[PDB]
Amino acid sequence: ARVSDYPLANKHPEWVKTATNKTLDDFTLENVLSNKVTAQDMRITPETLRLQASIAKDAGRDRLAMNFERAAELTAVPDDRILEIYNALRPYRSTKEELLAIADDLESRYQAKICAAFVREAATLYVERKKLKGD
Amino acid sequence: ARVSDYPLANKHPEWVKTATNKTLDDFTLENVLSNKVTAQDMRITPETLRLQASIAKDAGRDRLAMNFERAAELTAVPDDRILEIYNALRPYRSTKEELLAIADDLESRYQAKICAAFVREAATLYVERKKLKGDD
Amino acid sequence: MRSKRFEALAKRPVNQDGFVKEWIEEGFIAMESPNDPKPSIKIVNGAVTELDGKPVSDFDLIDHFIARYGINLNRAEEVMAMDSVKLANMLCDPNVKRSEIVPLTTAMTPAKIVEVVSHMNVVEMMMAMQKMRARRTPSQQAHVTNVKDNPVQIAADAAEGAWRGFDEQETTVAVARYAPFNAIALLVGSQVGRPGVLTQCSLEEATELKLGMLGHTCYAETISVYGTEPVFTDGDDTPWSKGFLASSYASRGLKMRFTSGSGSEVQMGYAEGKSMLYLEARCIYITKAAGVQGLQNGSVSCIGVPSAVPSGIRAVLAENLICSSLDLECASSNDQTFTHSDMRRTARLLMQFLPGTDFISSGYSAVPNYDNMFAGSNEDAEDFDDYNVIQRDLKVDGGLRPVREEDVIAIRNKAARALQAVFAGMGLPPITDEEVEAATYAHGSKDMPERNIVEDIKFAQEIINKNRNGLEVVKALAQGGFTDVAQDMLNIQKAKLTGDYLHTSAIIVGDGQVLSAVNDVNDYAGPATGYRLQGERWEEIKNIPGALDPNED
Amino acid sequence: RSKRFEALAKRPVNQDGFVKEWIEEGFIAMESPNDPKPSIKIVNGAVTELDGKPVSDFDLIDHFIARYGINLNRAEEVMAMDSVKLANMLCDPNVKRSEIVPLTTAMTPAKIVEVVSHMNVVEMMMAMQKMRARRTPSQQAHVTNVKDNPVQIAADAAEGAWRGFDEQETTVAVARYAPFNAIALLVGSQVGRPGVLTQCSLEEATELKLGMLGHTCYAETISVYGTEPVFTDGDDTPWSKGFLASSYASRGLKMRFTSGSGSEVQMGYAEGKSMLYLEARCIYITKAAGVQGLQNGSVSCIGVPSAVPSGIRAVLAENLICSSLDLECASSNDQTFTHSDMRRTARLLMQFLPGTDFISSGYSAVPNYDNMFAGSNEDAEDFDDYNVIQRDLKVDGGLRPVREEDVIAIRNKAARALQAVFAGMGLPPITDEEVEAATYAHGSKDMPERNIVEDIKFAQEIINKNRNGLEVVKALAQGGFTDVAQDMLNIQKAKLTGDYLHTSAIIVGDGQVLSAVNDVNDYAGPATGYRLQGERWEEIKNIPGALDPNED
Amino acid sequence: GFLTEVGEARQGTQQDEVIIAVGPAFGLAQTVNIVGIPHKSILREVIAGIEEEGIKARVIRCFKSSDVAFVAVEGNRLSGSGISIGIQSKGTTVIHQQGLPPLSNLELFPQAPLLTLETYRQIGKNAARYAKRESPQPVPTLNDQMARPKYQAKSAILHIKETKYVVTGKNPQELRVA
Amino acid sequence: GFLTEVGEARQGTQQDEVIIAVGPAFGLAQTVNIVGIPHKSILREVIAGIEEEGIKARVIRCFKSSDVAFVAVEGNRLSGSGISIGIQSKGTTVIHQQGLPPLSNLELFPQAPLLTLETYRQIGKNAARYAKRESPQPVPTLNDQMARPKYQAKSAILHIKETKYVVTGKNPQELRVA
Numbered sequence A: 001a002r003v004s005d006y007p008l009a010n011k012h013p014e015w016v017k018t019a020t021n022k023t024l025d026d027f028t029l030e031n032v033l034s035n036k037v038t039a040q041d042m043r044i045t046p047e048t049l050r051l052q053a054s055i056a057k058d059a060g061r062d063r064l065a066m067n068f069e070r071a072a073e074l075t076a077v078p079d080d081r082i083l084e085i086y087n088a089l090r091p092y093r094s095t096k097e098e099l100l101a102i103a104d105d106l107e108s109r110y111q112a113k114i115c116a117a118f119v120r121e122a123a124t125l126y127v128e129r130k131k132l133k134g135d
Numbered sequence B: 001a002r003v004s005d006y007p008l009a010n011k012h013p014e015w016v017k018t019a020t021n022k023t024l025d026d027f028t029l030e031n032v033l034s035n036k037v038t039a040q041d042m043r044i045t046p047e048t049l050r051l052q053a054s055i056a057k058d059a060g061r062d063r064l065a066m067n068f069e070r071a072a073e074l075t076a077v078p079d080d081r082i083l084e085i086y087n088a089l090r091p092y093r094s095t096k097e098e099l100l101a102i103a104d105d106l107e108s109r110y111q112a113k114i115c116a117a118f119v120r121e122a123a124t125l126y127v128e129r130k131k132l133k134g135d136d
Numbered sequence C: 001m002r003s004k005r006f007e008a009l010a011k012r013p014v015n016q017d018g019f020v021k022e023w024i025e026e027g028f029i030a031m032e033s034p035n036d037p038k039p040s041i042k043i044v045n046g047a048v049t050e051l052d053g054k055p056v057s058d059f060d061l062i063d064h065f066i067a068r069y070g071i072n073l074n075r076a077e078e079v080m081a082m083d084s085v086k087l088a089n090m091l092c093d094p095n096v097k098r099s100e101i102v103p104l105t106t107a108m109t110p111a112k113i114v115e116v117v118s119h120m121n122v123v124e125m126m127m128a129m130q131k132m133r134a135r136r137t138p139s140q141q142a143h144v145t146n147v148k149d150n151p152v153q154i155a156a157d158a159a160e161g162a163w164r165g166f167d168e169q170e171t172t173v174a175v176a177r178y179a180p181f182n183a184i185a186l187l188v189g190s191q192v193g194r195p196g197v198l199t200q201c202s203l204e205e206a207t208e209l210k211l212g213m214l215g216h217t218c219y220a221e222t223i224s225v226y227g228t229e230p231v232f233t234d235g236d237d238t239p240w241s242k243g244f245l246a247s248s249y250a251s252r253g254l255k256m257r258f259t260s261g262s263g264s265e266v267q268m269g270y271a272e273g274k275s276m277l278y279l280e281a282r283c284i285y286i287t288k289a290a291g292v293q294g295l296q297n298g299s300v301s302c303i304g305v306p307s308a309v310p311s312g313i314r315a316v317l318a319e320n321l322i323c324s325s326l327d328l329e330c331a332s333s334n335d336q337t338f339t340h341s342d343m344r345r346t347a348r349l350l351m352q353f354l355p356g357t358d359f360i361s362s363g364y365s366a367v368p369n370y371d372n373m374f375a376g377s378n379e380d381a382e383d384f385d386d387y388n389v390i391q392r393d394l395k396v397d398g399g400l401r402p403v404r405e406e407d408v409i410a411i412r413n414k415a416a417r418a419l420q421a422v423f424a425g426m427g428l429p430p431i432t433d434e435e436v437e438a439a440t441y442a443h444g445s446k447d448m449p450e451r452n453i454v455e456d457i458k459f460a461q462e463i464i465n466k467n468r469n470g471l472e473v474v475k476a477l478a479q480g481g482f483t484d485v486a487q488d489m490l491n492i493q494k495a496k497l498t499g500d501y502l503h504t505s506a507i508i509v510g511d512g513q514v515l516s517a518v519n520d521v522n523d524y525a526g527p528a529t530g531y532r533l534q535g536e537r538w539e540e541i542k543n544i545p546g547a548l549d550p551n552e553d
Numbered sequence D: 001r002s003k004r005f006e007a008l009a010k011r012p013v014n015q016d017g018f019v020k021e022w023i024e025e026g027f028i029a030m031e032s033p034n035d036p037k038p039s040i041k042i043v044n045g046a047v048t049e050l051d052g053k054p055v056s057d058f059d060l061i062d063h064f065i066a067r068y069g070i071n072l073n074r075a076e077e078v079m080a081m082d083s084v085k086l087a088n089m090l091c092d093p094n095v096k097r098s099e100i101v102p103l104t105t106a107m108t109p110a111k112i113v114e115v116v117s118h119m120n121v122v123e124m125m126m127a128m129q130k131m132r133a134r135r136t137p138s139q140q141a142h143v144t145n146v147k148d149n150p151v152q153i154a155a156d157a158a159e160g161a162w163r164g165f166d167e168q169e170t171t172v173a174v175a176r177y178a179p180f181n182a183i184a185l186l187v188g189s190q191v192g193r194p195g196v197l198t199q200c201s202l203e204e205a206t207e208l209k210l211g212m213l214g215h216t217c218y219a220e221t222i223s224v225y226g227t228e229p230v231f232t233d234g235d236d237t238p239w240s241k242g243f244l245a246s247s248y249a250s251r252g253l254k255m256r257f258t259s260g261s262g263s264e265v266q267m268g269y270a271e272g273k274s275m276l277y278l279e280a281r282c283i284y285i286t287k288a289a290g291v292q293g294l295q296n297g298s299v300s301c302i303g304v305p306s307a308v309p310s311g312i313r314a315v316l317a318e319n320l321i322c323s324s325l326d327l328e329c330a331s332s333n334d335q336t337f338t339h340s341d342m343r344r345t346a347r348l349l350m351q352f353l354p355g356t357d358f359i360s361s362g363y364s365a366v367p368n369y370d371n372m373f374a375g376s377n378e379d380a381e382d383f384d385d386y387n388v389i390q391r392d393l394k395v396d397g398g399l400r401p402v403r404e405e406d407v408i409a410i411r412n413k414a415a416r417a418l419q420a421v422f423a424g425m426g427l428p429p430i431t432d433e434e435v436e437a438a439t440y441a442h443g444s445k446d447m448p449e450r451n452i453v454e455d456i457k458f459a460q461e462i463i464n465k466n467r468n469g470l471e472v473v474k475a476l477a478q479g480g481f482t483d484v485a486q487d488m489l490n491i492q493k494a495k496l497t498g499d500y501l502h503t504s505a506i507i508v509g510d511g512q513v514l515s516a517v518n519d520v521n522d523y524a525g526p527a528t529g530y531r532l533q534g535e536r537w538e539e540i541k542n543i544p545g546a547l548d549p550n551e552d
Numbered sequence E, F: 001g002f003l004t005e006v007g008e009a010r011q012g013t014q015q016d017e018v019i020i021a022v023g024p025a026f027g028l029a030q031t032v033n034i035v036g037i038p039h040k041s042i043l044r045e046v047i048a049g050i051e052e053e054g055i056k057a058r059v060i061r062c063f064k065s066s067d068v069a070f071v072a073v074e075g076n077r078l079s080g081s082g083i084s085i086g087i088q089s090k091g092t093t094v095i096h097q098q099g100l101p102p103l104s105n106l107e108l109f110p111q112a113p114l115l116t117l118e119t120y121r122q123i124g125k126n127a128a129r130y131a132k133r134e135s136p137q138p139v140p141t142l143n144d145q146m147a148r149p150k151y152q153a154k155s156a157i158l159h160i161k162e163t164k165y166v167v168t169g170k171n172p173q174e175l176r177v178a
């Protein structure tokens, strides 16, 4: 996808699905009132986030794109787990092995390769800068 | 004179005379208290105004220069006559020939040749635009 | 005897402000400090080995984050070698396009870009800002709060704010557990005034994200970053925990930005002897390095620190310019009181208002300042007419418009009624017709009947405790007779699914049409180019109240 | 009724005057569809067509501008250049001022209006800091009071000079007071800082007579207008004003014209044209006459452009046209127009941020209740706000913070010097009690009353007996003020050299003339041109209330 | 409707009267001054002040211009005492005297918003006292520096509307006041 | 000269006490708070507010940090009830509890200029009521929006000076008060 394809809601609404594989046009007030759709398919998909990442790159914003790529992986991580991982990246909360185990969980359970690498990098530099538990 | 000669007070104070042929150096407090100089000596010369016109040209200000060249001519015109001529150029004060008479006076009596042309121009266009005496 | 001239001067409001002389050694200096590091970078392939005089073995977590993620390494060594005065010249040169500059400015180190803008006066910074701002059209963000957390008033104030032209609106609470009601009331009220307005509820960082997973907010902003490792650690965070939290928001389809601001580090006493502007640049590169799309900066709540020292307000403009030059959306503060003087706060506002930023204020108070739960903004609701007159005087689009009183009465009334049906359709404590009337004609919370806070608190908690989501709000609107408001609410949630508005400077205008720095790129190239106030927008800003028509004169 | 709109209705700005545009009658600040398309026709050294008008249809203003007002060397070349391109060059930091002035002086009035009309106020301010004639910006003050009390005038003038004003302006409530106001202002100014130029604004003929007596240094309120009916109803023509201008220079007196947007439509004779176009005509009259500078920016008609859209932007545009035509610009900010502090600060910042030759042409150095020009946009009670903003933004607004004991000492010396002048000239005495009151006054509410009748009789005798400025010098040298007397003589000596007749000239240091000739603005972008730095910066930094960290 | 033209105004010959000269739209297209004071009450107070001093008041309408000074010059050229009062529709007032230059005057009132009915009565009193060759203290008005900013644009609109009733070369008409 | 260290502060073993933890410069390099209230009076009010609720007040000086949060964290680690009060030299005060995250608190007073001796005494009461496992109403303070920007610069100066007395890796010292 390029900047010509932006915005998706106007150029390609048929390209946007939901985390329960419903299309975008299903989001009419009729389907809401019948409980034919409810809160959980109101969740952005990793495919959508990777399309925006591609568009961010075409617009010359590599870092924004990488943020979107991390976001695409984290759609698979439950709400409570997200907050647990965030809290553990805070200084003096974790040892180095705990952070490495967190990245292991991210990779092996949620296919979150970019977020795992990001967490392992943190673990390495928290050693260098003494931001680990017990420091 | 060029911009390098500006200001005259710093670069050429010896060039600066007064209309009564006094120098800048004469204007000390001792001469003022003794009345060896008076207010009638405190008048800029046509030479000084013409040096300043030449400096304005070097600085790219042609119209400023022309105003200075007219002012150099008007230094020789007495105070009351200056006011008389200003009043005559105001609308509906003068006929065409009084303006031309003023222009003739400026040229022949005070050598004010730029001002004469300036006034003759006024006389001509005051006819075209109905600004003379008896036109309102 | 005392001079009566100086007595009169001693009574002036400006002399109640706080001023101090510079303390260079401790970093109590806005900018241009002799302690700031000389620009330097060592690259070739892969990674950085020296950043602004610091070797890689000496990097703190911030140097690492910036070195690995924050600099366009493709051009760093080329732009490091360019003369800083020439680079400043290009910034404000109208014939060097934004798209030619961004590769270079993103390639400078923090000390390089600080050195570059330090050669500029405020006129030059303003000239550069109107080119470097990411979104072509400028906009505005408002605070919508009241001292009682009255949800009916928040909805009506949000509708008026949206009707005046605010494209983002922000709320917070006096009482912590009111927050779910504030978020819902702000969101409903905003969509009533103009569908597409984005809403946030600023809370503690974990509680804010939970409200976003429920669907009651659109964006988040108060995630803070800091410019020295000690201050960042004393904030109980690292760049990696902030970056992970940033991608967490995007993963839930929520636009977010960071908040920083000059003066935060010296206030904590750990500026490491550096100037406020140098430390703020570090914050901006942290934001860029995290992949966050924009930043709320311009000292913000620390404004009393740079405003006390020489060149402090110029420095605040400089940090806004650095933010935009780094291709980030800039929400340029003007959201906190700092002076007793109207002249002084106008001059500070004008720095961003005249060029335009993505959000001229990141918190214009849409309520009277006594109701402002961020402890007061640089502008409040009583300045609206002045703000509109200056727009008309200068032909400057400052994001707002004049409005008719009866239109605002009609839109506040509808917003109050819309929220009354939401509270009915979700089983929340009732909104009485008396509260609807009062919020329609209110100026602030002084005009509103008191509510049962203890009962309101209990039901608002039960919204997060039972995971009651934004689709229940849509249903209640559809069923209380507000199907037009219900569809707009569904369009807002549908925008979260597309991710279009996660992009730089994104807002939603018209009928669900996203407007961001992707499709509304700033293309300024001098006079008669870029954004010009003209056409129907100009006619809207022209039509201020009190403008007598000659045909009735 | 909405309490929100009640609160807004109580706001001071809602007491200002606003009207919708009336295009047909010229009640529009700029960008009118009625303004002429630029055009020029040159046949053998003379203009035969100007901005759509043939020479047979010229009015006196067209004739004056066509014959003296336009650089005909490049007029046809610049007429064919794209107006946006030219507006781009105006605010481009890499196009030198000396490259632009040949082009702007070759533009017709409609051409330059069209050019600047492409600019927003940020672009206009960016052009102003390059196009301003003098490198260093400056400030001019009003020094008046409701009683024409000469002791208070001298004291306020000394304070104004000490705060940094380089030109100071007075006028009278009672017309026959004028000689006393002129002398008091001149003596007071020289005491606060030798070199400050003074003027006393009166009817045109009376003002030139005062200048011939040596009691003033310059004149400014000589008006020009943008349509022939309005000019005629002012009882003048361009030739009578051009002659008056050269008369001032022939006596060694600096002078400038005054104009301002709104004057023509206020008289009802805008001829369907916008305020900005008519002011451009006023500016070209000034250029054509050879006058070095112009007081413009609406001035006393400020309530006319400020009532209509883009009016204040238009005020900035006219200042920018003035400087672009290589004229000194005294950019107004000298008249009240709004009840709102925010609105009048925005209006001041248009000139204060880039800097003009005189950021204001009349900052009130007295409280506005004493302002005999009916109130300025800024007055004495704004002094501390003005210095804080210089410090906040690192902008040189031409003023500086001052110590109370220093102002007390300089107001005392000035009141005592005028006491010696009044004694040596046989004028109604100035008592020590009047000196004490003038020393500590805020305004005339703090001064003992004088016998206005006796004062009037003796001030008239100064004119009727042709009593000149040299007698003032003699009175100072003989009453214990030789130092003040020498400074007054040096001021009179400046009229002999003609150095301060040039564009933007002021007198700084020890009689050093500083003008656009030797202090040429050389702006070429950031870190070039004038920059606030060094000792001037340390001066502006040191506001009252700035606590030192070692104190704390 | 309270003013009737009775023919071209005659030349006064006795130092006996003061001429009130009003603009071409006074009492017709405009019936109140800038702040809503009726033209009928304005004229009545000025006439009352003149007659209170034992002097006759003669009202004329000028058509050649709408500038208050030139309206007053037309008045003082016909006035038997050489004294006239010029009043524009929006309220601006001048006391003028035959022999003075057109733009000079005895007293000028250049802020119409600051005139009250009492001020207009004093204006008539002073004018008659000028006609009796006395030197009265100029009429005082209240001071208000915001009056000019607040009313300048409305003043210009009202002046443009009166200017539409100018007629070139039409002599002044004597008026009969109800 | 009213504070005196008396050795390393012991950890309280019974739920009998509230610890008042003061900053490094408290009552030494600075003797008044941001608005002139003497440190001695501040200490006496907080102490008395605690003891009026039947709870002993122990005072310690912290050294590892000048941050009011971490000063009170050191306090509540040694408080037998787990309740501590952190007080900086410039006057910022926080009521903390062991087990709360370091940047959380029971009650925070982040505008030292708006604090009176009334508030300081009331802070002592509420801390002891927290130690007695009661749920007191939060301490009410005055409100002034101008207070933050008016004093932020001076508080930064005072904080910087107090930070000069931080000594790494030094445990709190108990103090005796006069």
Ligand code: B12
Binding pocket: D223, D233, D234, D235, D263, D264, D266, D267, D268, D300, D301, D373, D374, E067, E068, E069, E090, E091, E092, E093, E094, E103, E104, E105, E107, E108, E109, E110, E111, E112, E113, E147, E148, E149, E151, E152, E155, E156, E159
């Ligand atoms: C704006 C203004 C002008 C404007 C508009 C005049 C117009 N006729 O429309 C301009 C710049 C064109 C102007 C020109 C002149 N003005 Co003028 N003007 C003012 C000013 C600053 C404000 C008046 C105002 O806005 N009042 C508020 C409005 C709402 O009330 P208003 O009653 O409608 O005001 C009208 C009158 O004031 C009238 N007016 C303005 N100036 C003059 C001058 C004379 C002689 C007359 C009869 C009327 C007049 O114009 C206003 C609108 O129409 C006053 C000073 C003051 N602050 O009062 C000087 C002032 C009234 N002007 C004065 C003078 C001297 C002149 C000129 C002769 C100057 C000149 N040599 O060109 C001309 C006369 C032109 C003319 N035929 O009327 C003097 C009058 C002195 C006197 N007692 O005789 C004043 C008092 C200034 C002063 N410092 O002495 N003026």
Ligand code: B12
Binding pocket: C224, C234, C235, C236, C264, C265, C267, C268, C269, C301, C302, C375, F067, F068, F069, F090, F091, F092, F094, F103, F104, F105, F107, F108, F109, F110, F111, F112, F113, F147, F148, F149, F151, F152, F153, F155, F156, F159
């Ligand atoms: C400026 C400010 C900051 C600044 C400077 C803080 C500092 N220590 O120097 C910055 C941006 C760095 C900051 C950071 C934080 N702040 Co803060 N801060 C403010 C603010 C807006 C104004 C305080 C002020 O200027 N007062 C005027 C001065 C003259 O009085 P003062 O007594 O000297 O003020 C000092 C204290 O307020 C202290 N302080 C400031 N923030 C915080 C937060 C905590 C937990 C503590 C213990 C102390 C503290 O710093 C000031 C001077 O050093 C207040 C809002 C408010 N209502 O006042 C929030 C506020 C006090 N901060 C708050 C928070 C949440 C934080 C952070 C935890 C945010 C974060 N997650 O990073 C950190 C904690 C930093 C720390 N280790 O203390 C909350 C406190 C909530 C609570 N009851 O615990 C407040 C009330 C904002 C809010 N509306 O929620 N803050």
Ligand SMILES: CC[C@H]1O[C@@H](n2cnc3c(N)ncnc32)[C@H](O)[C@@H]1O
Binding pocket: C221, C222, C223, C224, C225, C259, C260, C261, C262, C263, C264, C299, C300, C301, C302
């Ligand atoms: C109470 C600190 C909080 O206030 C906000 N804030 C205001 N100003 C600043 C600032 N200058 N730097 C960082 N954060 C700031 C931000 O949300 C932060 O978490």
Ligand SMILES: CC[C@H]1O[C@@H](n2cnc3c(N)ncnc32)[C@H](O)[C@@H]1O
Binding pocket: D220, D221, D222, D223, D224, D258, D259, D260, D261, D262, D263, D298, D299, D300, D301
């Ligand atoms: C009372 C008219 C006088 O006021 C001065 N003045 C103020 N504003 C303007 C203006 N806008 N145009 C011309 N002259 C002006 C000028 O000295 C003129 O003679």
Ligand SMILES: [Ca+2]
Binding pocket: C141, C170, C221, C296, C335, C362, C363
């Ligand atoms: Ca905000």
Ligand SMILES: [Ca+2]
Binding pocket: D140, D169, D220, D295, D334, D361, D362
């Ligand atoms: Ca002036």
Ligand SMILES: [K+]
Binding pocket: C226, C227, C260, C261, C262, C263, C264, C265, C279, C280, C283
């Ligand atoms: K910062």
Ligand SMILES: [K+]
Binding pocket: D224, D225, D226, D259, D260, D261, D262, D263, D264, D278, D279, D282
């Ligand atoms: K004009």
